[PDB]
Design an enzyme around this catalytic site. Structure first.
Site, PDB file in Angstrom:
ATOM      1  N   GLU A  80       8.678  84.774  57.906  1.00  0.00           N
ATOM      2  CA  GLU A  80       7.355  84.268  58.417  1.00  0.00           C
ATOM      3  C   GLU A  80       7.072  84.751  60.002  1.00  0.00           C
ATOM      4  OE1 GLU A  80       4.510  83.794  56.666  1.00  0.00           O
ATOM      5  OE2 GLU A  80       5.740  83.850  54.647  1.00  0.00           O
TER       6      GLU A  80
ATOM      7  N   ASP B 105      -1.705  86.636  61.664  1.00  0.00           N
ATOM      8  CA  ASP B 105      -1.092  87.264  60.446  1.00  0.00           C
ATOM      9  C   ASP B 105      -1.450  88.530  59.698  1.00  0.00           C
ATOM     10  OD1 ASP B 105      -3.188  86.198  59.037  1.00  0.00           O
ATOM     11  OD2 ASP B 105      -2.015  86.055  57.162  1.00  0.00           O
TER      12      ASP B 105
ATOM     13  N   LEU C 238      -1.125  78.588  58.659  1.00  0.00           N
ATOM     14  CA  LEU C 238      -2.540  79.437  58.866  1.00  0.00           C
ATOM     15  C   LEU C 238      -3.277  78.074  59.227  1.00  0.00           C
ATOM     16  CD1 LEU C 238      -4.988  81.308  57.821  1.00  0.00           C
ATOM     17  CD2 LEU C 238      -4.811  80.171  55.848  1.00  0.00           C
TER      18      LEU C 238
ATOM     19  N   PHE D  63       5.254  80.789  49.860  1.00  0.00           N
ATOM     20  CA  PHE D  63       4.764  80.669  51.299  1.00  0.00           C
ATOM     21  C   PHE D  63       3.969  81.955  51.423  1.00  0.00           C
ATOM     22  CE2 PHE D  63       5.529  77.777  54.803  1.00  0.00           C
ATOM     23  CZ  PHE D  63       6.032  76.687  54.190  1.00  0.00           C
TER      24      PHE D  63
ATOM     25  N   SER E 143      10.016  87.981  35.450  1.00  0.00           N
ATOM     26  CA  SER E 143      10.865  87.532  36.329  1.00  0.00           C
ATOM     27  C   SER E 143      11.257  86.168  36.230  1.00  0.00           C
ATOM     28  CB  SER E 143      10.549  87.778  37.857  1.00  0.00           C
ATOM     29  OG  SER E 143      10.376  89.476  37.747  1.00  0.00           O
TER      30      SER E 143
ATOM     31  N   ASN F 271      13.645  93.903  38.006  1.00  0.00           N
ATOM     32  CA  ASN F 271      12.390  93.779  37.694  1.00  0.00           C
ATOM     33  C   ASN F 271      11.521  93.328  38.485  1.00  0.00           C
ATOM     34  OD1 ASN F 271      10.015  91.838  36.197  1.00  0.00           O
ATOM     35  ND2 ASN F 271      11.106  92.956  34.556  1.00  0.00           N
TER      36      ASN F 271
END
Ligand SMILES: CC(C)(CCCCCC#N)c1cc(O)c2c(c1)OC(C)(C)[C@@H]1CC[C@@H](CO)C[C@@H]21
Length: 445
Positions: A214, A223, A235, A307, A320, A335
């Site tokens: 992040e 962002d 955020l 996230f 997955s 995958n």
């Protein structure tokens, strides 16, 4: 003064035993040191760095010791050799300097790693090519001063002589041993700190994981999506108003921040979002079974995904998610590589996918090659400690009590370890050091 022949003790086959070991090990030790000394000057990327200036200086102190010690030890013991009364003080003094410089070379290598790990952005300025050589010279000069003192004006006249070394007193050895133990105390204290700071960089938990992905920031930022954010992706508002975001910040921290938050505030607000992320996964029918099967590391990789694109997003990766629950790591790794998430953020995806297949934090390991260089040194320091402990102990015992020929014999076989140590050390660098092993494919040819 005691006679020169009195220090030559060979009970038959032990004379030919030193002759076969000391001559073979001494020639093989000088073979590896020269293969290291040239290697640093041969490669353009190795010569510039100050860490390798101490690796090279060790190999220099080792090469000279491997030839000066093995020459004079086989000469004096096996062939009963006595060159001169003044030349002997030069031989011993040359051995004393080369081996003291090996210890000092490693102390500077240990100091080099302390600065590198404790103060990483200020390292390159705190230690330069020139400063390292200045420190090398100082160490080499103090090496020569303590080592050649007997050669100069110090010799055993009314003061008692040492039963291990001829013409040298007990008081001078005590001084050199205390000086060497001071250099070792320096090494032990500095390296104990090196391992503590290396553990800090290899240490991983989710905060340190998402800090990379992040991107931590204690000032209000924007962002990829364009909205105002703070710390580890918190955020604030979707709104194009910074004053709205600044209000949201003051609301979430409970204090008049004015756009800046403290680090432990960002960590507080982070764990607030992690707890909220975990609850989301649990209160998600498709995500919860996946979370139940994942371990403390792989669970963090899933939270990393939540996230990034939220619970509703991650839940979509049914293909997955089924493999993650079935522990088919390699099948999930390929995958997930076929997803839009990988096509939009490959940089982050590769790392997240790795944490899912390995189960290790290695994908988020900071300064890994600089940290593995500190690991190399640790082993080099371990061998040094092992080999030198019996040799120095007999020299310490020499000053407190009188030792018979039985102890004198044992000392000669301990002295052979210094030669083994100087032979083993360049083999450690030839196996661990990735930059040396990568150059081993190009430099030699
Ligand atoms: C490697 C080391 C442990 C270094 C100790 C430095 C001296 C301490 C001070 N200040 C060492 C051990 C030795 O046994 C000897 C050494 C050096 O030097 C030569 C010249 C080879 C000697 C030949 C005559 C022998 C007499 O018994 C002692 C031999």
């Amino acid at each position: 003064a005691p006679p020169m022949k009195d220090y030559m003790i060979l009970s038959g086959p032990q004379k030919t035993a030193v002759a076969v070991l000391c001559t073979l090990l001494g020639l093989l030790s000088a073979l590896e040191n020269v293969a290291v000394l040239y290697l640093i000057l041969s490669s353009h990327q190795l010569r510039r760095k100050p860490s390798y200036l101490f690796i090279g200086s060790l190999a220099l102190a080792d090469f000279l010791a491997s030839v000066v010690f093995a020459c004079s030890f086989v000469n004096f013991h096996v062939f009963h050799g006595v060159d001169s009364k003044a030349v002997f003080l030069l031989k011993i003094g040359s051995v004393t300097m080369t081996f003291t410089a090996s210890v000092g070379s490693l102390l500077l290598a240990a100091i080099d790693r302390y600065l590198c790990l404790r103060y990483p952005p200020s390292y390159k300025a705190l230690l330069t090519r020139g400063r390292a050589l200045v420190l090398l010279g100082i160490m080499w000069v103090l090496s020569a001063l303590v080592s050649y003192l007997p050669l100069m004006g110090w010799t055993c006249c009314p003061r008692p002589c040492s039963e291990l070394f001829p013409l040298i007193p007990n008081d001078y050895l005590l001084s050199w041993l205390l000086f060497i133990a001071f250099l070792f105390s320096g090494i032990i204290y500095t390296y104990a700190h090196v391992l503590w700071k290396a553990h800090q960089h290899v240490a991983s938990n989710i905060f340190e994981m998402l800090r990379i992905d992040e991107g931590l920031r204690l000032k209000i930022y924007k962002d990829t999506e364009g909205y105002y954010t703070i710390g580890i992706g918190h955020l604030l508002t979707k709104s194009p108003s910074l004053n709205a975001a600044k209000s949201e910040l003051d609301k979430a921290i409970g204090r008049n921040t004015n756009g800046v938050i403290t680090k432990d505030e960002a960590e507080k607000l982070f764990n607030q979002d992690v707890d909220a992320a975990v609850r989301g996964i649990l209160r998600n029918a498709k995500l919860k079974p996946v979370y139940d099967s994942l371990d403390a590391v792989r669970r963090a990789a899933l939270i990393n995904m939540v996230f990034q694109m939220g619970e509703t997003g991650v839940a979509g990766f049914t293909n997955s998610l089924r493999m993650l629950q079935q522990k088919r790591w390699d099948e999930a790794a390929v995958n997930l590589a076929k997803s839009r998430w990988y096509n939009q953020t490959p940089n982050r995806a590769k790392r997240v996918i790795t944490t899912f297949r390995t189960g290790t934090w290695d994908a988020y390991a900071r300064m890994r090659l600089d940290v593995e260089l500190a690991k190399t040194l640790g082993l080099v320091l371990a061998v040094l400690l092992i080999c030198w402990f019996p040799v120095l102990a007999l020299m310490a015992h020499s000053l407190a009590t009188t030792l018979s020929d039985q102890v004198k014999k044992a000392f000669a076989f301990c002295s052979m370890l210094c030669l083994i140590n100087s032979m083993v050390n360049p083999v450690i660098y030839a196996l661990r050091s990735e930059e040396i092993r990568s150059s081993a494919h190009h430099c030699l040819a």
